[PDB]
Design a protein around this ligand. Sequence first.
Ligand SMILES: *[C@@H]1O[C@H](CO)[C@@H](O[C@@H]2O[C@H](CO)[C@@H](O[C@@H]3O[C@H](CO[C@H]4O[C@H](CO)[C@@H](O[C@@H]5O[C@H](CO)[C@@H](O)[C@H](O)[C@@H]5O)[C@H](O)[C@@H]4O)[C@@H](O)[C@H](O[C@@H]4O[C@H](CO[C@H]5O[C@H](CO)[C@@H](O)[C@H](O)[C@@H]5O)[C@@H](O)[C@H](O)[C@@H]4O)[C@@H]3O)[C@H](O)[C@H]2NC(C)=O)[C@H](O)[C@H]1NC(C)=O
Ligand SMILES: *[C@@H]1O[C@H](CO)[C@@H](O[C@@H]2O[C@H](CO)[C@@H](O)[C@H](O)[C@H]2NC(C)=O)[C@H](O)[C@H]1NC(C)=O
Ligand SMILES: *[C@@H]1O[C@H](CO)[C@@H](O[C@@H]2O[C@H](CO)[C@@H](O)[C@H](O)[C@H]2NC(C)=O)[C@H](O)[C@H]1NC(C)=O
Ligand SMILES: *[C@@H]1O[C@H](CO)[C@@H](O)[C@H](O)[C@H]1NC(C)=O
Ligand SMILES: *[C@@H]1O[C@H](CO)[C@@H](O)[C@H](O)[C@H]1NC(C)=O
Ligand SMILES: [Zn+2]
Ligand SMILES: [Zn+2]
Length: 158
Amino acid sequence: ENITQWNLQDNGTEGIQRAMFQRGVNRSLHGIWPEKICTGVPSHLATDTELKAIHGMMDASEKTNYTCCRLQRHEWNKHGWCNWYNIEPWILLMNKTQANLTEGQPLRECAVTCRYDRDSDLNVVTQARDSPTPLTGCKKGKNFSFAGILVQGPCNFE
Ligand SMILES: *[C@@H]1O[C@H](CO)[C@@H](O[C@@H]2O[C@H](CO)[C@@H](O[C@@H]3O[C@H](CO[C@H]4O[C@H](CO)[C@@H](O[C@@H]5O[C@H](CO)[C@@H](O)[C@H](O)[C@@H]5O)[C@H](O)[C@@H]4O)[C@@H](O)[C@H](O[C@@H]4O[C@H](CO[C@H]5O[C@H](CO)[C@@H](O)[C@H](O)[C@@H]5O)[C@@H](O)[C@H](O)[C@@H]4O)[C@@H]3O)[C@H](O)[C@H]2NC(C)=O)[C@H](O)[C@H]1NC(C)=O
Ligand SMILES: *[C@@H]1O[C@H](CO)[C@@H](O[C@@H]2O[C@H](CO)[C@@H](O)[C@H](O)[C@H]2NC(C)=O)[C@H](O)[C@H]1NC(C)=O
Ligand SMILES: *[C@@H]1O[C@H](CO)[C@@H](O[C@@H]2O[C@H](CO)[C@@H](O)[C@H](O)[C@H]2NC(C)=O)[C@H](O)[C@H]1NC(C)=O
Ligand SMILES: *[C@@H]1O[C@H](CO)[C@@H](O)[C@H](O)[C@H]1NC(C)=O
Ligand SMILES: *[C@@H]1O[C@H](CO)[C@@H](O)[C@H](O)[C@H]1NC(C)=O
Ligand SMILES: [Zn+2]
Ligand SMILES: [Zn+2]
């Protein structure tokens, strides 16, 4: 079982969260994490042409104006190659996961990190996953905002 984490838009968070806001993106895939973290030399070096096939995944780096392919390459190198063995299945899963994220809130969306906003008395979700996890930056007893969708608890089922 693989952790599936993604970023959520927020004008209040600098970096990708703000870029996503400006571009009308709500969810941008961060990664699919099996337990094993790749160490050592990748079996194949990912090209920009391969990495751009993950449509909708925005890079976390300003050095590419939040496009491709620093984050994508990093994901292949650190979590990809040693687990999927070939770039093809990995791009297919990554692309299809990002498609489901673009087509609204998934099956299980659980907050990972928040930015508590005093003006709206809300825990704005900056990163979510498909499994519950101890939170960070989330004020106790306050409601959650997953790219505008308001939820009672830390885990959103739509
Ligand atoms: C969660 O995360 C997991 C990773 O940690 C994901 O699992 C991986 O899934 C990918 C597919 O999405 C698998 O990738 C393929 O791997 C085979 C080789 O696998 C063989 O060896 C590994 C170990 O070395 C074993 O894998 C697993 O074993 C456990 C045992 O209990 C079981 O769970 C499964 O059996 C599982 O597979 C196992 O021994 C396995 O047999 C590659 O061959 C794949 O590449 C394909 O083959 C092409 C090369 O030649 C091919 O040419 C023709 C086409 O002309 C093909 O039809 C033939 O197959 C022929 O071989 C490639 O060029 C081409 O890209 C093609 O796709 C592919 O790399 C990977 O094994 C899984 N890894 C693990 C560790 O399980 C899991 O999907 C994730 N799940 C979710 C829900 O997110
Ligand atoms: C990646 O996912 C996209 C969807 O985000 C797939 O795009 C579809 O491609 C077919 C065939 O060209 C079109 O008929 C659909 O209209 C496309 N869908 C959308 C929503 O644009 C794409 O095929 C996927 N595969 C790869 C390898 O990138
Ligand atoms: C991002 O999420 C919002 C909802 O949180 C999407 O929809 C908004 O509301 C109506 C539908 O109820 C849409 O037609 C508007 O475009 C959205 N308005 C605002 C101000 O966000 C929105 O469409 C999603 N973005 C994408 C790319 O699908
Ligand atoms: C987005 O943030 C910038 C910088 O804090 C601010 O100037 C702008 O008014 C913000 N827009 C909204 C809609 O909050
Ligand atoms: C995408 O959505 C469908 C329907 O919710 C689901 O069955 C499928 O497993 C999802 N695909 C991925 C790659 O998460
Ligand atoms: Zn674990
Ligand atoms: Zn990583």
